[PDB]
Structures are given as structure tokens and as C-alpha cells.
Design a protein around this ligand. Structure first.
Ligand SMILES: COc1ccc(S(=O)(=O)N(CC(=O)N=O)C[C@H](O)CO)cc1
Ligand SMILES: [Ca+2]
Ligand SMILES: [Ca+2]
Ligand SMILES: [Ca+2]
Ligand SMILES: [Zn+2]
Ligand SMILES: [Zn+2]
Length: 158
């Protein structure tokens, strides 16, 4: 499927969950992009205005895309593969409780997965992969991509 055909990729945070400190949302998203730039030639920059490649959105229920959210639990987030318009965009269910830690749903870990999709990755069948489509908290301070994630992303870039 689709990949970004350029190395400089922009993102923008459309709005902020009230669940977290603003600075902690910025840092979680930044760190999640870094996971992928670590293993590809991509460079990611946060822009404050105008059209970004990847728009990061918090929203609940129906939110304008035909992929309605389902309240607390279940679907936590979804994202669109590379492309124009909404392509690349990553949406996070405001009905979850987003955190920097093991409580609620960890924003950083979820965003690593969502950004994987924004870059063109699909789901992995390997429970060890961040792209495995089941949320399970792991210690974020020492998080690492699985072999499967790295082979997946390096099949698309670099
Ligand atoms: C660690 O990163 C994630 C793990 C799971 C999910 S999820 O919302 O739970 N997911 C939807 C999805 O894959 N969106 O990209 C899976 C099923 O549809 C519902 O369980 C999101 C991010
Ligand atoms: Ca949900
Ligand atoms: Ca977009
Ligand atoms: Ca919330
Ligand atoms: Zn959406
Ligand atoms: Zn997914």
C-alpha cells in the first residue's frame, strides 16, 4: 500500500485531551514519532498552523470520518495510511483516559502504533509487535520495537 514519497514529514496537534497536561501530550507524540525516525530516513516536525501531513486529533463518537468511536474501551484510536487530505491522520478516542503512565490508556504506546499506520504499516499477528491490534501496557521508559515492527517498517522505508 501507500507510503510517503518524501523524507520531511510534518505533524500537527489539532486539539488536546483534557486528560493530560499539554506538555505531556506534546512529549508523548514527539517520542512516538522518534520511535519511527530511529529506524527510517524520515524526519518529523511539529507545525502549529496550516496543513500537516499527519493531523493528530482527539474526538469522541461520530467525528466526521465514517469511523465512529465507541465510548470507553474497545476501539482506542485509529489512523489513515499515507495520502492526501485525511491520509496520515491519527485519531484518538476522547472517551478513553489518556496518561503518561500505566493507568488509563498510555498515549505514547498507542501513538507509536497509530503512527505506524500513518506511515503505511498494517497489523501484525505477533503479540510482541507494537502493531499487534490489542492494547497491552508495557513500560514506556524502556519500550522497543519488535523485530517484526522493524522488518515491517524497513520494508516500506530506508
Ligand atoms: C498499542 O497500540 C494500539 C493497540 C490497540 C488499538 S485498538 O484501538 O484497540 N485497535 C484499533 C486499532 O488497531 N487502531 O489502529 C484494535 C481493535 O480494533 C480494538 O481492540 C489501538 C492502538
Ligand atoms: Ca473507545
Ligand atoms: Ca493528512
Ligand atoms: Ca478522555
Ligand atoms: Zn476518526
Ligand atoms: Zn491498529
Amino acid at each position: 500500500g501507500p507510503v510517503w514519497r518524501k523524507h520531511y514529514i510534518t505533524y500537527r496537534i489539532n486539539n488536546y485531551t483534557p486528560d493530560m497536561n499539554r506538555e505531556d501530550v506534546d512529549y508523548a507524540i514527539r517520542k512516538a514519532f522518534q520511535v519511527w525516525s530511529n529506524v527510517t530516513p524520515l524526519k518529523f516536525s511539529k507545525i502549529n498552523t496550516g496543513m500537516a501531513d499527519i493531523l493528530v486529533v482527539f474526538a469522541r463518537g461520530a467525528h466526521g470520518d465514517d469511523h465512529a468511536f465507541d465510548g470507553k474501551g474497545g476501539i482506542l484510536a485509529h489512523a489513515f495510511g499515507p495520502g492526501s487530505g485525511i491520509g496520515g491522520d491519527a485519531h484518538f478516542d476522547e472517551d478513553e483516559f489518556w496518561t503518561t503512565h500505566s493507568g488509563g490508556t498510555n498515549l505514547f504506546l498507542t501513538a507509536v502504533h497509530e503512527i505506524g499506520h500513518s506511515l503505511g504499516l498494517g497489523h501484525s499477528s505477533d503479540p510482541k509487535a507494537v502493531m499487534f491490534p490489542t492494547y497491552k501496557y508495557v513500560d514506556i521508559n524502556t519500550f522497543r520495537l519488535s523485530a517484526d515492527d522493524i522488518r515491517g517498517i524497513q520494508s516500506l522505508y530506508g
